[PDB]
Amino acid sequence: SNISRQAYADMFGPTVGDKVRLADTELWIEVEDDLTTYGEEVKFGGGKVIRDGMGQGQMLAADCVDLVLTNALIVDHWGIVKADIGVKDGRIFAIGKAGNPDIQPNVTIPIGAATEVIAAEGKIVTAGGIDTHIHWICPQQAEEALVSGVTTMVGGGTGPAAGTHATTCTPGPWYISRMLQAADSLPVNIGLLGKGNVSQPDALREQVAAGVIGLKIHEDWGATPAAIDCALTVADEMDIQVALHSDTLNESGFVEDTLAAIGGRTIHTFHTEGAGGGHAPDIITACAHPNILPSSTNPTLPYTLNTIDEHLDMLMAFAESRIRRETIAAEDVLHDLGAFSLTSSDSQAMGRVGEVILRTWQVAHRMKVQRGALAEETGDNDNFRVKRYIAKYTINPALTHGIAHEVGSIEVGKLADLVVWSPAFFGVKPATVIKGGMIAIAPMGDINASIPTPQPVHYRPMFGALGSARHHCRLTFLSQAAAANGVAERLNLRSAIAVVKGCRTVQKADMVHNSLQPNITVDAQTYEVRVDGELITSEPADVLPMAQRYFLF
Amino acid sequence: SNISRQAYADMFGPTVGDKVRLADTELWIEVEDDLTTYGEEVKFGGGKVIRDGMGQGQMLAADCVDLVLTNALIVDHWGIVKADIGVKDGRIFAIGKAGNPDIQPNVTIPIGAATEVIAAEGKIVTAGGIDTHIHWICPQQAEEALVSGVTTMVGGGTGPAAGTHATTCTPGPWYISRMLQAADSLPVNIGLLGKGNVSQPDALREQVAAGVIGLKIHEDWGATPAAIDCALTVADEMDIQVALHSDTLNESGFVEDTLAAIGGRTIHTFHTEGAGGGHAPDIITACAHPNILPSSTNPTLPYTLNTIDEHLDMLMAFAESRIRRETIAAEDVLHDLGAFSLTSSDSQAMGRVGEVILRTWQVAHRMKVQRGALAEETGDNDNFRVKRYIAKYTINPALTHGIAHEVGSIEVGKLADLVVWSPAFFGVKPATVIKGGMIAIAPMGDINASIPTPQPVHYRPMFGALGSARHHCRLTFLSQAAAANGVAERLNLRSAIAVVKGCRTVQKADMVHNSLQPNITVDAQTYEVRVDGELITSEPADVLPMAQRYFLF
Amino acid sequence: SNISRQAYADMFGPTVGDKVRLADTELWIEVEDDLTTYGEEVKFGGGKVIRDGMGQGQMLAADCVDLVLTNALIVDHWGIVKADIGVKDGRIFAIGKAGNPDIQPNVTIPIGAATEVIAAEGKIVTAGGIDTHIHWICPQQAEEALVSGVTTMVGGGTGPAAGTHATTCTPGPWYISRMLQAADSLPVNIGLLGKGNVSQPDALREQVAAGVIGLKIHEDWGATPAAIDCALTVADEMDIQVALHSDTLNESGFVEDTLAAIGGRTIHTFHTEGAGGGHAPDIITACAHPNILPSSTNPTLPYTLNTIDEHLDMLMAFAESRIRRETIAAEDVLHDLGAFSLTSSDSQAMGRVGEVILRTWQVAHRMKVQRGALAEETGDNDNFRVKRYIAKYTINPALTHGIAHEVGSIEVGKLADLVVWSPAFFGVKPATVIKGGMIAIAPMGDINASIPTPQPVHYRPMFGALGSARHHCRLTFLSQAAAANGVAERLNLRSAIAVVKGCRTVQKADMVHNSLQPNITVDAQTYEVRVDGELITSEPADVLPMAQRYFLF
Amino acid sequence: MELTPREKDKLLLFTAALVAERRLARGLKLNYPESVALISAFIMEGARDGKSVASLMEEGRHVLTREQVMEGVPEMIPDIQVEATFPDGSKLVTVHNPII
Amino acid sequence: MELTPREKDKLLLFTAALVAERRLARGLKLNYPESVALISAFIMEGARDGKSVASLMEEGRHVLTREQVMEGVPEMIPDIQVEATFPDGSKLVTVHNPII
Amino acid sequence: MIPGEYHVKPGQIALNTGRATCRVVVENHGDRPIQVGSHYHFAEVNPALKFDRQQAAGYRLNIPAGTAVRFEPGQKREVELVAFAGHRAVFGFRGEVMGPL
Ligand code: NI
Ligand code: NI
Ligand code: NI
Ligand code: NI
Ligand code: NI
Ligand code: NI
């Protein structure tokens, strides 16, 4: 039997050699591989394949997956392939060919009576995003981020307090404890950062022992060489990560003095470009070092016409020393080159919580438009650029904070945090958001309707976000010390617990597709950024995709 | 002392011989009995009867009810009587005469210091509805159904997944467990259905042992004779119910082959008319058998002008074999005759979750208009037709699923799930919805107002729907096996647990006021339905009551 | 170094001698004291004081506060002073000078790595309000009251039931238990009142043993001399408070007979003016007795043009005996004189739940306008009148119900329930509401915005109102008996528990700034109120502050 | 009014349509959400008027043309569905390829 | 439409502005919330039109004058901030002393 | 520019390659329509369909996965079958095999 490739694409989604446009951008992805056996694809429906004795086997629950995503087009750092995804016990069981071994060939993902089905044909499936620069100013941020496709949120705060408005710090044992307890109520995985600004190591050890997975050094609390050194010493001891927002005022020293204080130790530099904070005007030079894991916050991504104008007031003499067109323009290119490894939000503190993914793709679009294909690109597609950029908000943030053993990508053994997208709305509005094997939120039509599609369709929380089901499908990350001291039992935390590890051993070379260490310089007077003497710059966009065609406001 | 019957009706509600119109329909009910002692009615208020030493006694909590609904007009399958209702420990204590035995005669429901009062004079009180065809596509369905007057929801699903969109199945132990946990968060009683389509009995026993109270056989998972037989065998063993959505395609056999596979064993046939699924075009003939408990889904109830037109797309060659004007028209009459015993929704899968009660009364209205009085009717009232129809969404669904020992009617010992209605809004918008003795939802005016009545008045959840109070006032139904294996303790379920029983012994003869087994046939070419050779048909309504006079949209 | 007082006020808020207008009223407060050391004030921000080694010390968590409110202008019954507030373990640690003892002088509130900061410069901080006349008609009242600045709610009810609509009673053990469990879900401290109308003491003891902290005697349940006596006898035994709504009908006796039945025992008279209930037309004379703690409900506060007109229907022969212009006008003056000691709402039963604070200040404004300065006033400010009025909804309600050891004022050791106000919105719309050391609700802008200030800004619940964090930051008050019988463990209450005490020993002389016992009389025919023969009256307002300039509707 | 959850939900759609309506009046080419909202609201009003499902299925295809919406928008909307209370109860109206 | 929480939140602001708009039309002097809502909605529409942040920062100061609002209102609003989707994405518009 | 558009490369896909196939004439002798799915064990279809069941043993319809063939009453037509793979164990359907083959 034969079938035309067009009819096939309409029935099972695209296959090898087919290209798909990402939303309304100029980025095109080409299916690199297809793990199916033509003619043996599984489809659910009346008279279709997944039925008793046919595509559904006779195996017991233990011998089959709980959930199968059929004919999914996976877009991950390791590849863009077509395959079925199997989920078992809340985790990714396998990527391959689903079906019934009794009558079908090459079945690697067994479907049985205990298997639920999610039809992914014609859809793109990605790992849930991971935002590592969250200011816990309000609990509403969790739903906003979840809706955008972000499933893990790392940050600090206690609510709308002055300290939190400015820094990602959950100060001390009491607040840390209270926030760990409040975390059980949120539908995303959570890890907290304590206040790392102190020159007494015991004051830091207490916070780590209380539960934080990292310490934030912020200039508002004093980003002095003494504080930075103290925080890194405790980090090396307790295997937790340090996030830095340096001395913008150059009060205690210049960028080189801060770098000297860090002493080659692992550290995550927040908003490395500088607009969001850091030694004026050269904190961006940090991306040249092997021990620095650099990230960008999202208001500066990508460089557009209104960027500079809006930034002055979001900030409001050192304003014009902090807001620089030169470093803002360069940042985009540095992302395209892989010099900057992560993207984050900086939620409600010079950052948009629901725009991490959306902005990352806009930068990729603008860079393709301005710079053409990357040197690593093969074929007439943007597959490599896509892998490079998706890594910025998935696997790289996970590696930087020691949680890549649990989340960060679509790999066997990892928690099943997945986002299903229709190609036309990729990166803008997801079709389904799965948390730990359960749908946590999705667009839903009229509740009283005869079908789930009638208007009004808007995002509403599903069963995966309800009480005990939620606790079972989310993770609260703890430091190894907190886990050992029995903090979870003491605070009576109800969610699944995960421990962070490998924070001190990760380096720039470990950032997937983003390990460039450029010989970068910044002119002290003009602020021009140069890599190997070449000027790094770009043009501001007047119009961007993933914008006015999708939003009501 | 004397008082005119009109002034009396205005003060204590109608009494024996008085008639009341149900909403804006042509259905009239006549009070059959009044359990009060004229002059001794209890009324609450300043200077009224329920006061210390007067209508309120000196007894301790153990010797008096927690709640009394005064002067209620009860409408249940057993009668339409005026009386006081006593509730104690979350259950119906007694139906009779409330008061203080110290100074009042014939007191059967003692009122004391521990008694709360709900004024029901001029109101109609009914048992909470029971919907047995729920697709758990989204958690929002619970509030929608509760608001309509439905207090128990049986069905299956895991959220907005392909499998759930199409079938009422919660596949396997993992999903069953997760959904049982999520159930604690919903303000209605819940029982789950697993996937019954498998030819290996152990795969089914696992699901029952996990917690499901029934198994759904759906054609999308393969409604073959082998699967049907396997499911019924396990059902007979574990005392759980089977719900069927037959082979519309006639792929494995015709309706008679399916009936043969069932082999006289008890089974609940979903949407027996066929539009929602089933052997084309004669699945409707199932209502002739003694072992079949037939129900209808609600989009086809009642037959109207726009019915056919809307149905084609809600479905979208076998479309015109499934959507038949002939069987749709007949279905209404079969309900009026008692051949069809239940009504359900088929929530968001060709059914409206908040319209089960509303549509049942519209069918009754249209049948009275077209067919006149029933042969069982006595007096100039529609009392019997009313009892016949109310049984379709209360007691009958409860009997069919083995939960009639807990809910289904206003009888002593049963859980106090009651709905209070103003006659003008009967079946459309309730005044109060009580779950397990506590008000769970009700229309509420301006929160900051001087009284609870100022606009805007809209349904808002009350104390009975909050945290622990909710857990105490709702039931999660389990299979006898799950209860024995200690599933509630393992999953740490917080709500009250109830066990199903008597699912295999219920038959058509047991359906209250709806036990007709007609000699029914369907013409294979014309699709005409005939009972004893007589053509069964009806005319489509152009306008219906309980519609545009009550809804904003 | 020197700095002008204006620039100083702009930078750290007002200091000694500076005056501030309360919202848009004519009330002005003058800073009486400042606990800072000029030049050593703590300010948070980039390059500011609270930084490592500077304003932030090296002490461990145990040796520093969890939260510090910097440069707060405190307005409490004991004074109007400028100072820093320290909060530790959810309680008020100290009022003084915050900082780092290592380099700063006079530090009484140590700031360390474990300290969160709330910038209060230019803000007014007050204790959370306490409403003791709550009808638990719906759970939504809690959020409405919290938003207005009320953090403790005492009352009774079971939801929108007839008994609750009319009285503040939670009838019997079952309902009391259910409501105690539902309380864990609400973001305010809660104490319940049972039904005190019974002549059998055991029926009352049961309710107290079940958990109520008081008993409400309401005329609708029979406010007879026998019932009143029985309730007071049990109150004296179990150290719980009694709230009274007397016999308006004069059925069992006149006001003097009720007073005689009370027999000099402590009692809280609700809506003492009479419009909301009580012996017509002289229940107001109760404020002359030493054992009476009198409060007003809010619809009559203050006397305005539309007051009488609206009241007839909110009530609907004894209507015109209950609604009297004479007693309504006098009530305002009696509050100004300190004859009436508390203000409350009477939520949704002739009272506005979100208008207790707002109306108390409107009365103060109208009294200043009509009567000028109080005899106790010193200086050209309204400091004493302000202290007298704030006491009416904070400390006095707490003393009356035996919970002043936990809440009621900004004093060391008390729970940290604080409200932060911008002077322009004082008493109308708060900036931050802190419950037990955690922000529970606050106005919040666009969730996806770059900052928390963009529109739309509306009140949204914060971390202090979420699950377990909420349980840790709220208190459920129990009677000493209930606490002893282990009710909290039995019902498995998750919130912090507090016990009431000192209810029987409090008298009129104990009411802060409101201990006047006037020689008051009421003319039986004309209803004119006279104190020492002088006519007590006032003029109705045509326009009021804290009204149309702040609300959208 | 005793508004049920569904009645309140529809108020959201109505308001979304008011936004689209005013922008169309300004002469702007509507985007994805604006288009869906405008056409949906039209149908609900048609049901309130008492028009049949069949009539609305057709009428709904003449509310907006391809020249009144942004590029790609017509392709993002293969159909529009909405339910409303007709004289004979709630009915589903499906409009295929509403924008041409 | 697939409305996200933020899109739904903005619908609240739009509706608040409709209230203010009708009252201003009646000739009433606007209060605090009405003023904030009216000016904010204006800016959102400007962004939908494609105006720049710079242009709106100025235009927003000429929506209401001191004579169209209640006494004290101008002082209660030192600035107004709102974000909207411009052709180049979401941008923050801050209008200082909008009412003079 | 069409958001999320495909660029499917032209050509065709060969289904179920390298598997044994056979053609059989089937005739619907029933008075009601019968529709058969791609993976249903053809030898166990509705008894009203008349054909050589012995030849259809271990076979299914050689059509795109998920599709179906419809037979109206009295309809006769030739269909192409393809053999099952995997363990070639048949369970379910009308319960005629319930084991390997
Ligand atoms: Ni920063
Ligand atoms: Ni930040
Ligand atoms: Ni069905
Ligand atoms: Ni169904
Ligand atoms: Ni009262
Ligand atoms: Ni009251």
PDB file of C-alpha atoms in Angstrom, chain C residues 61 68 115 158-159 174 189 192 324 334 343 369 397 437 463 492 543:
ATOM      1  CA  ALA C  61      19.404  33.946  62.861  1.00  0.00           C
ATOM      2  CA  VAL C  68      12.137  44.821  60.007  1.00  0.00           C
ATOM      3  CA  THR C 115      16.428  39.643  58.030  1.00  0.00           C
ATOM      4  CA  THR C 158     -22.903  27.860  59.264  1.00  0.00           C
ATOM      5  CA  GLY C 159     -23.378  29.562  55.914  1.00  0.00           C
ATOM      6  CA  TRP C 174     -21.420  19.211  64.860  1.00  0.00           C
ATOM      7  CA  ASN C 189      -7.728  34.664  62.981  1.00  0.00           C
ATOM      8  CA  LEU C 192     -16.662  31.214  67.100  1.00  0.00           C
ATOM      9  CA  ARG C 324     -34.943  56.329  65.364  1.00  0.00           C
ATOM     10  CA  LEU C 334     -21.411  58.899  72.497  1.00  0.00           C
ATOM     11  CA  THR C 343     -17.176  49.384  66.463  1.00  0.00           C
ATOM     12  CA  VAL C 369     -16.137  69.070  62.363  1.00  0.00           C
ATOM     13  CA  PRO C 397     -12.551  44.323  70.901  1.00  0.00           C
ATOM     14  CA  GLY C 437       4.822  37.926  60.083  1.00  0.00           C
ATOM     15  CA  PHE C 463       2.156  33.669  50.271  1.00  0.00           C
ATOM     16  CA  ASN C 492      -7.064  17.600  63.286  1.00  0.00           C
ATOM     17  CA  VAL C 543     -20.959  64.310  51.958  1.00  0.00           C
TER      18      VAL C 543
END
